[PDB]
């Protein structure tokens, strides 16, 4: 169905109920505030590094965040370039 | 806000979860009950029930108490 | 988590070695420039969501299969290189 | 080449797999057989497993002789 950016989870499922600003989160993770806001505003992705910081900060697994990023990049790709790719790629394996 | 959108997001998290903390930690989930069935809030009316296994959420249901 | 396993290692050892294609032949099947396949085979760069789809269609796999290997590799790497640094830095906001 | 390194790699693939095709397609797996299937680690050892919607389960090693 729709691509779900890991930033939507961070914003809707953590930030809203907790209340922290982008800066507070950024301070906790040890990263520059624009890194967090890129994510919160869904304009950039979550690196393995960011995922580690998030998982330690928010008591989750780092794979939780990378799985969301993976599902997001993949749904996006699929509905941007899917037909272009399925129509053109040569099949080398039965 | 929209209930469908929230549902989509909850399903997203369920599929992405690697450990029970992934569903317990987000305060938006308001997780309630480790092998017993747990549930996460979708809204004031609907909750997703499920069983946690090593291999992720199983037997996902909706329940409206009551 | 043991050693990090780059998806390039799977590509090279589990497909290329038994099938026999050259980097350029795979690049031609995927519809990408040959250096992009080299990068991966020589484990010099990651696999994108786009490259994952092309591989999955080309080699009869799922795209997630390739991204999962990329995930685990990026994550083992980060934990080896920056893990002890990060776990001593980050402030916990959630009980 | 090294059996340890091959094992580590087969294990990686099992954990990453999402559909049976992920384990059947790579010819280096030489996959043989909802029933149990197995993949070649080398001339002597194979990883047995049952495929499930939730990935590989009951993983074991077998040396057929």
Author numbering:
A (entry chain A): 6 to 99
B (entry chain B): 23 to 55, 60 to 92
C (entry chain C): 5 to 99
D (entry chain D): 23 to 55, 61 to 92
What do the authors report?
GraTA (Growth rate affecting Toxin–Antitoxin) is a type II TA module recently discovered in Pseudomonas putida. By sequence similarity, GraTA is most closely related to the higBA TA family. Here we show that GraA does not contain unstructured regions and forms a globular dimer while the toxin GraT contains an N-terminal intrinsically disordered region that is key for transcriptional regulation of the graTA operon as well as for the RNase activity of GraT.
With one His-tagged GraT monomer bound to each GraA monomer, a GraT-GraA2-GraT hetero-tetramer (hisGraT2A2 for short) is formed. Binding of GraT does not affect the structure of the GraA monomer but the relative orientation of each monomer in the GraA dimer is somewhat displaced. Upon binding of GraT, there is a 2.2° relative rotation of the GraA helix α3, which results in a 1.6 Å decrease of the distance between the HTH motifs. GraT binds on a negatively charged surface area of GraA, which is located opposite to the DNA binding surface. The contact surface area of one GraT monomer with GraA2 is 488 Å2. In GraT, residues S27, E30, R31, K32, A38, R43, D44, S47 and G50 are involved in hydrogen bonds with the GraA residues R7, E13, E18, D64, T66 and N72. In GraT, on the other hand, the first 22 N-terminal residues together with the 6-His tag are located in an interstitial space and could not be traced due to lack of electron density. Instead, GraA inactivates GraT by inhibiting its binding to the ribosome due to steric hindrance via clashes between GraA and the ribosomal RNA as well as ribosomal protein S13.
